Nucleic acid binder design. Structure first.
Ligand code: MG
Length: 276
DNA sequence: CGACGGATCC
DNA sequence: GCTGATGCGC
DNA sequence: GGATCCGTCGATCGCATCAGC
């Protein structure tokens, strides 16, 4: 069955207007995504903050078009030192953050280019490209060890401000989060191990899944479709991209969107509206 | 990772 | 410099 | 004997490198 995201709710449950719009997008190659007009879509979306995953692009190769975003002028990029053309994340912001950091602790010695932390006035934003378990699960144990390290890193954040975590967390939490749950229970992204790590992330930090909090029983809402077999045209997909929020931020939550129609990648964008 | 073929379930 | 093949990861 | 379960197979993409010219 196809899916149509509901209209943008730009007002908090108590009636407060949204003041902050965050967009997150696994672009599956920054240079290719720009050629497929991804940046034209970002301009129409006009977010205050834009988070990108899988940029696959070093610091010298970023297209000029990107610097020329005047409403997103503060930009922070990280790529892995070893595997250029792999991973890579970015964070673009209207206002300048108070602090930006990279990685989950040892980045200066282990530059993986998967995590950016940006502290703002009233909240901390983490965007993440979570490592894949791999075809045939060959890196699943590494993913479980990474999940645990990431969990610990997020819990032990010095700042007492609430947390927004977004990006490609590379797991469909529950059966409602993908089209073919039973056929995928031993595939990367829906193993019991990755699902349990997601549940432990929510409990340990603690965090709430913004989209599922608002739409707890809505099926067929996905953010990824394999390029192959025309999966996107049949909406055979997985929800892999999330906005996870501190409990204190839930009254500020206006809406959590899935931008199903925006092309340019095998993921589509997600967008958060907060009344801060 | 979806499609597909083959086995098992009542 | 440019194309297309191959390898790799996802 | 329709529905479900489960293991196998080949499918798209972006980017790096390499061969060739
Ligand atoms: Mg990907």
């Amino acid at each position: 069955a196809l899916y149509e995201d509901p209209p943008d709710q730009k007002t908090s449950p108590s009636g407060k207007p949204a003041t902050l719009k965050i967009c997150s997008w696994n672009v599956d190659g920054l240079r290719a995504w720009i050629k497929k007009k991804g940046l034209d879509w970002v301009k129409e979306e006009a977010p205050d903050i834009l988070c990108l995953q899988e940029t696959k692009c070093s610091e010298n190769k970023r297209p000029a078009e990107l610097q020329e975003l005047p409403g997103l002028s503060h930009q922070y990029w990280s790529a892995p030192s070893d595997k250029e053309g792999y991973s890579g994340v970015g964070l673009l912001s209207r206002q300048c953050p108070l602090k930006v950091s990279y990685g989950i602790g040892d980045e200066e010695h282990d530059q993986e280019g998967r995590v950016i932390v940006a502290e703002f006035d009233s909240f901390v934003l983490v965007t993440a490209y979570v490592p894949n378990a791999g075809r045939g699960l060959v890196r699943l144990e590494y993913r479980q060890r990474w999940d645990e390290a990431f969990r610990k890193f997020l819990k032990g954040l010095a700042s007492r401000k609430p947390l927004v975590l977004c990006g490609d967390l590379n797991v469909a939490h529950e059966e409602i989060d993908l089209r073919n749950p039973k056929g995928n229970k031993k595939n990367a992204g829906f193993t019991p191990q990755e699902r349990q790590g997601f549940g432990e992330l929510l409990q340990a930090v603690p965090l709430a899944d913004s989209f599922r909090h608002l739409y707890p029983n809505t099926p067929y809402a996905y953010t990824f479709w394999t390029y192959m077999m025309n999966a996107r045209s049949k909406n055979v997909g997985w929800r892999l991209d999330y906005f996870l929020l501190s409990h204190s931020l839930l009254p500020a939550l206006c809406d959590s969107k899935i931008r199903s129609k925006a092309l340019g990648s095998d993921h589509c964008p997600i967008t958060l509206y907060l009344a801060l």
